[PDB]
Symmetry: D2
């Protein structure tokens, strides 16, 4: 099972667990997901967070919906060598979801050398 490759708890020293925060404004749900809130995770050409995906399983339903996916594609690479571009995309994802349902939000994160990471929160 692929779940055997997904981690949900950080080790001390490096933050990989996606942190999910959301605000409900009417039928609009603004979701912020980020890796390394307190202690930033490295963002270099050889070690960086590649993307964050958000899923939503509505209360009482059987199928999860992928809500969105954000790819962080610049990590300092340039013709002048690794970490020389001065262009870096930080692992902060924002999603605006339109729904009146409640349920579970799941975030999936991938570090290029540290595998898959997950987290979830209850959408009320």
């Amino acid at each position: 099972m692929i779940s055997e490759t997904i981690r949900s708890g950080d080790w001390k020293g490096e933050k990989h667990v996606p942190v999910i925060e959301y605000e409900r404004e009417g039928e609009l749900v603004k979701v912020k997901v980020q890796v390394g809130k307190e202690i930033p995770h490295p963002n270099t050409t050889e070690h960086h967070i590649r993307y964050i995906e958000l899923y939503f399983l509505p209360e009482g339903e059987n199928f999860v919906y992928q809500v969105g996916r954000v790819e962080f594609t610049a990590h300092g690479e340039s013709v002048n060598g690794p970490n020389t571009s001065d262009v870096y995309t930080e692992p902060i994802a924002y999603f605006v979801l339109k729904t009146k349902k409640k349920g579970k939000l799941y975030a999936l994160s991938y570090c290029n050398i540290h595998g898959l990471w997950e987290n979830e929160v209850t959408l009320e």
Copy 2:
């Protein structure tokens, strides 16, 4: 040339042109891109905005860097038919870029039935 398929000007009645706004906070550049700010573009199972991509060409350089890509993946589809899930991802993209450079920001947008759309702004 693929540019022959990309549009940069809306026709009256439907907004496709990605609108780019940004705020510079130190070395952090917070970029917001959205389709249909004033008049929302439809978001249905048969007609919706699929994604928004952001590119950055630094001043005086020769190669553009893709900064990020955001996919809006929920458009009301469910086992109960099109437009029945009550789960929709709005075409609003937020990117946090770390750079001290200046240059040109380009946004690329795709409507599932109306092709590719582009816009650009100067990052100062």
Copy 3:
């Protein structure tokens, strides 16, 4: 845990399970992944396979690597209505991996209305 939303099963009985096949040619590993090999899966504007992702966990290592991702983006939509374009992308993915390692290959599939599906095979 997100694994609670991922389904698996026999591909000879469940049309959603990604079927993984591979051929090793020197240091090159040609991997073919497909949904609906036995029982074809629908490909319509309202119901279709969105993408297939391939992961590789080398023997004896602790972190899985995402090998590739393929998005199937055309499902008949057009200005003339759903299922009118006559352009459909079939859920068949090919990956050419360069490695001498052995381990486990995992495939992850997403149906727009039937959630996430997984499968895995041993890479010899």
Copy 4:
């Protein structure tokens, strides 16, 4: 205009140009796209091809359709340093398109340090 950042050229002389080949089998169109067919392109942690996208503009129509997107995500990175994993995804993309239409096929390629590249062929 974004086209000012996209390059094209002869694939027999420029290693970045995506080479498009296809075979029509009934209503099925098997498309193979690859970068570095003539002159291999590097695939290292600091310099590699990130993805290949395929578009199709049917004859006589006004809107291009994105047919598919393939991301090559492994480029040797590991906890042991750049280029140490022995896992590399080669920039070879395959797409199986179902259509009876004719038109133009466009491929878009991105090198992490050499920007965007394009190519096109006529689908008969």
